[PDB]
Design an enzyme around this catalytic site. Structure first.
Site, PDB file in Angstrom:
ATOM      1  N   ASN A 136       0.368  -1.280  -0.207  1.00 31.97           N
ATOM      2  CA  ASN A 136      -0.027   0.189   0.210  1.00 31.97           C
ATOM      3  C   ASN A 136       0.973   1.032   0.239  1.00 31.97           C
ATOM      4  O   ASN A 136       1.561   1.640   0.876  1.00 31.97           O
ATOM      5  CB  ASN A 136      -0.458  -0.045   1.138  1.00 31.97           C
ATOM      6  CG  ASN A 136      -1.829  -1.204   1.845  1.00 31.97           C
ATOM      7  OD1 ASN A 136      -2.823  -1.434   0.363  1.00 31.97           O
ATOM      8  ND2 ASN A 136      -1.660  -1.786   2.454  1.00 31.97           N
ATOM      9  N   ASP A 165      -0.112  -5.829   3.259  1.00 34.76           N
ATOM     10  CA  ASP A 165      -1.457  -7.068   3.770  1.00 34.76           C
ATOM     11  C   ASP A 165      -0.238  -8.332   3.712  1.00 34.76           C
ATOM     12  O   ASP A 165       0.132  -8.771   2.464  1.00 34.76           O
ATOM     13  CB  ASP A 165      -2.094  -7.230   2.600  1.00 34.76           C
ATOM     14  CG  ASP A 165      -2.885  -5.785   2.653  1.00 34.76           C
ATOM     15  OD1 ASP A 165      -2.970  -4.833   3.585  1.00 34.76           O
ATOM     16  OD2 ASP A 165      -3.501  -5.010   1.195  1.00 34.76           O
TER      17      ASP A 165
END
Length: 130
Positions: A46, A53
């Site tokens: 991200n 993640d």
């Protein structure tokens, strides 16, 4: 490792996920399915906040595991993010349980809310013997 559906269902059940904090196995399966397609080595960076993640449940390093590369982050599950990339999902299950111990419960994952909440999830465990 990329789990076959029923293979993962029995694996999760054995690890005590069926009904953990009121969450059925079919919900956990629907979550893992949309989060990683049942892939334990799945990762999604991200760029927005520099977090990543990790694993079959796509647990985020901003809050849950430590990978040492997010400028400001916490490690609520007290695990190295590496632990969430093993073929053996026990540690990932331990963290997944930790996440749901907070108020939102299974609602912590936006994907669960959009793709599993108020849906027919029986398909995820039918024929698996769980």
């Amino acid at each position: 490792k990329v789990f076959e559906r029923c293979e993962l269902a029995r694996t999760l059940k054995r690890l005590g996920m069926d009904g953990y904090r009121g969450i059925s196995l079919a919900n956990w399966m629907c979550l893992a399915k949309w989060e990683s397609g049942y892939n334990t080595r799945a990762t999604n960076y991200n760029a927005g906040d520099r977090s990543t993640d990790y694993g079959i449940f796509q647990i985020n390093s901003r809050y849950w595991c430590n990978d040492g590369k997010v400028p400001g982050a916490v490690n609520a599950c007290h695990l190295s993010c590496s632990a969430l990339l093993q073929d053996n999902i026990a540690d990932a299950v331990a963290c997944a349980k930790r996440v749901v111990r907070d108020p939102q419960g299974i609602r912590a994952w936006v994907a669960w809310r959009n793709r599993c909440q108020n849906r027919d999830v029986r398909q995820y465990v039918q024929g698996c013997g769980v």
